[PDB]
Symmetry: C3
Subunit: 538 residues, 3 copies
């Protein structure tokens, strides 16, 4: 039966009570919060919060407290949870958050912020932690934020969304947390740091009926729109109902984020997902994001996905699949591509992205990197290692001169002959092969004539893939085999790139101290020759 104590009393500077008044528990007088975990404590905690702000004192939650209205942590207040079991259990209604953090340097340490966790309910809708637009350098660290769900999509925030943690602040730190909710973490602010968190909503073990649809209670690990200058590092992101780490693109202008050294696996959509769903605009785009040094694997609809984004980089990641893909995604096969580039939803091109030094492992032999028609300005570095996957795939040969494939791409085309007069028709056995390495294309062209119709004058081979309307700095071609040409002794064929139409190669021949451009006149219906060389294009 020890002395009475209250944060409302005035004590002398030398007293036990003054010393104790530096730390406030909501169970202390005059707040007197319940300790049974079931009685509402919102009034007691709100009073303790306001007192600590007014008097400049530390607030420590020493139990798991039931609440029914938002706790607003403002004015630089820090909430410290006494133990990992302390914190709040939220019965806050739809349209409000359990905890709202705002102001300069406000934050929350430790403990638990727990929603109802009824993801099968078609009526419960809740939101966990909000850092609002006036949060500056706020934080939540070491906290289990779980159980915020909302079946069916909202039309507005007032419906309740199912966010675990939603950051709209500047410089927010989210670190050492466990976030598990319909949208585990949502990013809509600037300069945040999302570090060493465990992020999942465990869609794979949820029991929610498949296929996935917009009615699901299980979406992304990290969903980002209007996110700028975040660093997302050292997180363990897995088994989410949509993508592990997503940036849009869907009413969002998301730029300059750095996604590094995370593990992202077993998600039902993509692993790391950057793309445009809404049409590109000054207020909707995904630009200049860095994806580096991550391990991404067994994500159903591709491990690293770029759709219509620009100036992004994918460097030094290990992206892979194994046969557990066929188990966890049984019945619902997806793209199964290690690194895929695509158009935006409304056809926008991937522009200016940089893919280098990644290791892609795909035992199905699916292409480790895919490139779609329309992509421009991208660089596919030769430090990428696809030896344990399929080779890089391009959807059309014109990509080889509108992008730079240091990782080499090989293909074929059907050549034709363009006589100055008349015509020459080639047998179908005629064949052209190209390989692009950087801004060099190597060629082998086999020309087997099947018929002629009064050909005469100059002769060109056409059409070199990718070269239409391009120019070149240098090129080099030989003809190393021929048969049934009308050539005098000592006359040999020569070949040189057509500098007017640089997807054509001019074929001509020697005449002592000069050359002659009459090769079409030397062709017969049974002529054959083979051309080899390269073009350094601009």
């Amino acid at each position: 039966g020890v002395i009475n104590f209250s944060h409302a009393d005035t004590y002398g500077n030398d007293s036990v009570g003054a010393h104790l008044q530096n730390v406030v528990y909501p169970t202390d007088a005059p707040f007197n919060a319940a300790t049974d975990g079931t009685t509402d404590t919102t009034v007691a905690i709100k009073s303790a919060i306001a007192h600590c702000i007014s008097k400049g004192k530390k607030l420590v939650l020493n139990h798991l407290f039931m609440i029914t209205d938002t706790l607003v942590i403002s004015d630089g207040l820090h909430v410290e949870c006494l133990t990992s079991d302390s914190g709040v259990k939220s019965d806050v209604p739809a349209g409000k958050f359990a905890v709202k953090i705002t102001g300069a340097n406000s934050g929350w340490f430790g403990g638990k912020i727990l929603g109802k966790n009824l993801p099968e309910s078609t009526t419960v809708r809740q939101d966990g932690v909000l850092f609002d637009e006036n949060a500056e350098y706020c934080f939540i660290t070491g906290t289990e934020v779980t159980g915020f769900f909302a079946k069916g999509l909202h039309t507005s925030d007032a419906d309740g969304v199912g966010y675990g943690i939603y950051d709209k602040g500047y410089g927010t730190l989210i670190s050492k947390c466990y976030a598990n909710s319909k949208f585990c973490v949502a990013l809509g602010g600037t300069e945040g740091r999302v570090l060493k968190n465990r992020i999942t909503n465990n869609y794979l073990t949820s029991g929610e009926a498949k296929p996935w649809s917009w009615a699901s209670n299980y979406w992304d690990g990290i969903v980002s729109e209007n996110a700028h200058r975040y660093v997302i590092a050292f997180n363990d992101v897995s088994a989410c109902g949509q993508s592990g780490i997503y940036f849009g693109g869907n009413g969002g202008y998301s730029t300059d984020n750095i996604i590094v050294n995370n593990t992202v696996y077993a998600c039902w959509n993509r692993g790391i997902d950057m793309g445009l769903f809404s049409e590109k605009s000054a207020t909707n785009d995904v630009l200049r994001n860095i994806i580096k040094g991550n391990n991404t694997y067994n994500n159903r609809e591709n491990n690293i996905w770029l759709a219509g984004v620009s100036n992004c980089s994918v460097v030094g990641n290990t992206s892979w699949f194994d046969t557990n893909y066929d188990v966890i995604f049984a019945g619902y096969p997806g793209g199964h591509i290690c690194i895929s580039l695509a158009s935006g939803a409304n056809g926008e091109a991937c522009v200016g992205n940089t893919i280098d030094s990644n290791t892609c492992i795909d035992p199905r032999g699916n292409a480790g990197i895919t490139v779609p028609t329309g992509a421009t300005g991208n660089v596919f570095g030769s430090g990428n290692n696809l030896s344990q996957a399929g080779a890089i795939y391009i959807a059309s040969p014109d990509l080889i001169t509108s992008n730079r494939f240091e990782l080499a791409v090989t293909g074929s085309f059907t050549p034709v002959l363009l006589p100055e007069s008349g015509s020459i028709t080639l047998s179908s056995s005629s064949t052209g092969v190209f390989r692009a390495t950087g801004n060099r294309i190597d060629f082998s062209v086999t020309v087997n004539v099947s018929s002629i119709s009064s050909p005469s004058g100059n002769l060109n081979i056409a059409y070199l893939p990718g070269m239409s309307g391009k120019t070149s700095s240098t090129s080099m071609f030989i003809i190393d085999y021929w048969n049934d040409l009308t050539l005098s002794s000592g006359v040999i064929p020569l070949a040189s790139l057509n500098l007017e139409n640089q997807d054509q190669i001019t074929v001509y021949r020697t005449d002592g101290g000069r050359v002659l451009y009459d090769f079409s006149s030397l062709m017969k219906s049974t002529s054959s020759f083979i051309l080899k060389g390269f073009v350094d294009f601009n």
Copy 2:
């Protein structure tokens, strides 16, 4: 002479005592731990631990407490050390740890966990901190864990091993610690985060007699077996008796770890060491680890070492040596290679690894990267910078088509001529040079005949290094010099890759509007010619 206080008494909610009961010091009643640092306090601390778990209270160690049995931190309990001098001094016997952390979110902040620190003793054996197999998201942060040693190898854990911190948990955080013990940190769990630690056992200043042997009390900074999905970042790892950061491979299946932005230097074995000692199996392998952005230097038996591992990457590291190597390792020289690939101990190949964008500095001119016979599927990127080291070394020329050397490799071979009939013998001055860049090999072949024996018919040059049984997409060859051939005026030599045996080049000649394959008939005993060109192989 102030009021009595005890965590065993019941106080009113409004009392001083209830407020104080939220924080437990083991010196408080009823625990009454000694404060002299020499009296055993195990019973008092065990009681305080059990009380804090039962009552949901915070445990603070306010002295350095002597203990003789394991403290078990379970059930989400956090141990907070009051000051950097608080914590435990361990007299726990061999076969047990000083501290065992288990359960969900249990952990330890600050202070000291101190072993006997008698590394010269042939009888003292101790272990420091264990995160056991039931640890989930546990942690130790800000702690000096030192002095756990055990001279001579254990046969089982019950002997006592000499671990400083041993993590077998899921999601364990080890951060801001100083770990110094026979094995400073040992990793055998999943999804741990080993961040911004100081790791060393100071072998160089130990005075333990050299050479190193299995009886040493000084092994690795980080030793890992069955380690999955760790991030090891921002650590300062140095002067260890074996390797700085090691993954096996020796009864361990270690995969998907990310080792980034560490400094690793002056270790007696390797800096960052990934390899197989036990034979490769479904339960013993080292796969898909990422080594990125580290600074590794003056490690005696090589800075970055890969032995029989697969799908690993080494990207963007700076690996170097200076003349202090000759000082600290005087008398005991080692490999002194910046980045070395080797076979596993039982001959297993390095498969599918990716080495790019590293800067290697070796003033001895030792090769900055070494590649052994048998390696396959590896990619050596051209962004590596070995200008301040020796050039990349390959142990046999066949490696150039079973791996992809964007970082170019040059070599030589001795050509032969393969006449269709008869024989042609070349002088020893005949020479072939190749350079592989990616999937292109450039060649120069000088053919000087010394004798002939009735050669006639077709002619091939052989054997192109790496090309045996390979195919090609395109190739291009000329003969730009010859002497003492039997060629009529206007007949010139031609050369084209043999498409049946693509390590041979067919040599033939012109005959007006066709070509003729009778070159062996045009050779004399004094013939010479020189061939130049390239092959784009598949």
Copy 3:
């Protein structure tokens, strides 16, 4: 009116008072610090510090305390700030710091360390936090360190410098801080970790009159001299009066630092700035630093700047500009280069640096990477993406064989003909084009004669850029066009690299079963020919 309490009294082990004595507030007796924020509290805080060190207790600052002399945090003491508004307001005079941290494991958590913040004053000079040369594994975490300024440069530290935080210790952690001062953070120690800080002195909104000059009160975000083995990661560095992150080079030997995953923008000098201002010496150099995965943009005098440094790497950064550059730097245009290499201030060469996998965006089309004359041993990887900037710029063609440009460089030269006897003069329409890719140079040379003067004998083309005195492993050249040569039927021109002078190409011709080196004799005043090929140089 509760019981008296004092840290000077002796209490029983079972007492309230003994429990309370583990935590010291400076307002407690016998220290009795003022709480008004204006009365000097230095004596009270110094006494509390000494008491906590002597008795092994925790020190908590529970108000913002005014101080007029340095607080020395030594002996492993930690200062904990009760709230984000607690800490110290410094009226310490010029030549001393507000707080000095030294010893093993000493540090400061939270709160504020506030200077006078009068950057317009020509007389106020102050310094914030010092980690001195005897600091080992000390830290400051979670602290706002602002307002330390000093207009005009010091001549010595005793003048007062304007440091926010100055680290000369070993292993110092600076994390989660806001640092804003004349020099926000200064690094002069070893193995520090500067993590997830906000760093700025807001030069752009200061109102200090422009142009910037050495009299400014606004210098770098991070200024480093004699800095070794730091990791600088996850910081938000912007709007500084000089550079964001600087290493010298100016009385400093700075090596082995790792600068990763930071955002650096809007600085008035450079973003990430490594360079030599003082002449290179054994005690002044910048070596082996790693710059990886940063986003650097709109820094006035270039985003990433290397001046006379060696063995550094720039890998995987996104470096860019937009039209806001023209707004914030209106009136004061700067270099506006994404990645620039330069000589040191005294002409020292950039040696051995590695630039790969960066994405450069410059809508002005300025070169994304610039290389100066004299640079050697550098590697410019082909994974760099400059498609959205100007192409890499080299200041002289000789750079192509003293560095390795995997990112290809194209240029031109004016050829000459070197007859064995006599002379040949070319028309000005004669032209040579080269492209260097790695250690391969491709060439196209057009030779149009305008006059001859008795030429006879052998013939060489000269001079190939970069090749003077170089050797080669292989090379391949053809002549694919000619006109007005004196060639009999069946005689064709041949070309081969001059192996004595490998910046010359020998031009000669066929003569049946041999070749003849008399090409100068076959030239006329109207001759033309075109040469194509490549050299693989060593």
